[PDB]
C-alpha cells in the first residue's frame, strides 16, 4: 500500500507549563527559544511589562 | 475538578489534596481547623485578682 511517517528527535528542556481552571495543559513556553521566552520564564508569568 | 490521571492534590504547600481514596475514588480537601489566640486582660494584681 501507500503511507508515510515522521522521524524526529527530542532533547531535554524546561518550559513554563500553564494549566487552566479545568486542569488541562493550554500554554507552554520554553527557555531556549527566545530572550522573551527566557525573561518570561524567570518571572513565572506570561505577561512581561516594560 | 479532577481527572482520572490526576489523583494527587498539591498547590503550593503540599496539602493533603491527594486523598484520591483508592478504596472509593473520593478526593478529600485537608485543612487544619481554627488555631486560636490568647491574651489576658487584667486590671493588675493590685486592684483585684
Ligand atoms: C474544561 O472546563 C470545563 C469544566 O467545567 C469543561 O466542561 C470543558 O469541557 C473543559 N474545557 C474547556 C476549554 O473549558
Ligand atoms: C496599689 O494601689 C493602687 C491600685 O490602683 C496603686 O495605684 C498603688 O500605686 C499601689 N500601692 C501599693 C503600695 O502597692
From Swiss-Prot, chain B:
Q: Which of this chain's residues carry glycans?
A: 46
Q: According to the UniProt record, what happens if one changes residue 13 to D?
A: In strain: Alpha/B.1.1.7
Q: Which domain of life is it from?
A: Viruses
Share what the entry says about its subunit structure, partners included: Binds to host ACE2. RBD also interacts with the N-linked glycan on 'Asn-90' of ACE2. Cleavage of S generates a polybasic C-terminal sequence on S1 that binds to host Neuropilin-1 (NRP1) and Neuropilin-2 (NRP2) receptors. Interacts with host integrin alpha-5/beta-1 (ITGA5:ITGB1) and with ACE2 in complex with integrin alpha-5/beta-1 (ITGA5:ITGB1). May interact via cytoplasmic c-terminus with M protein. May interact (via N-terminus) with host bilirubin and biliverdin, thereby preventing antibody binding to the SARS-CoV-2 spike NTD via an allosteric mechanism.
Q: What does this protein do?
A: Attaches the virion to the cell membrane by interacting with host receptor, initiating the infection. The major receptor is host ACE2. When S2/S2' has been cleaved, binding to the receptor triggers direct fusion at the cell membrane. When S2/S2' has not been cleaved, binding to the receptor results in internalization of the virus by endocytosis using host TFRC and GRM2 and leading to fusion of the virion membrane with the host endosomal membrane. Alternatively, may use NRP1/NRP2 and integrin as entry receptors.
Kindly provide the name given to this protein in its UniProt entry: Spike protein S1
Species per Swiss-Prot/TrEMBL record: Severe acute respiratory syndrome coronavirus 2 (2019-nCoV)
What is the primary gene name for this protein? S
Covered range within the whole protein? Answer: 558 to 606 of 1273
Amino acid at each position: 500500500g501507500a503511507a508515510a511517517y515522521y522521524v524526529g528527535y527530542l532533547q531535554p528542556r524546561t518550559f513554563l507549563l500553564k494549566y487552566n481552571e479545568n486542569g488541562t495543559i493550554t500554554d507552554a513556553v520554553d527557555c531556549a527559544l527566545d530572550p522573551l521566552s527566557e525573561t518570561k520564564c524567570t518571572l513565572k508569568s506570561f505577561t512581561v511589562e516594560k | 475538578k479532577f481527572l482520572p490521571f490526576q489523583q494527587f492534590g498539591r498547590d503550593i504547600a503540599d496539602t493533603t489534596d491527594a486523598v484520591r481514596d483508592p478504596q472509593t475514588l473520593e478526593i478529600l480537601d485537608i485543612t487544619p481547623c481554627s488555631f486560636g489566640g490568647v491574651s489576658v486582660i487584667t486590671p493588675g494584681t493590685n486592684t483585684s485578682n
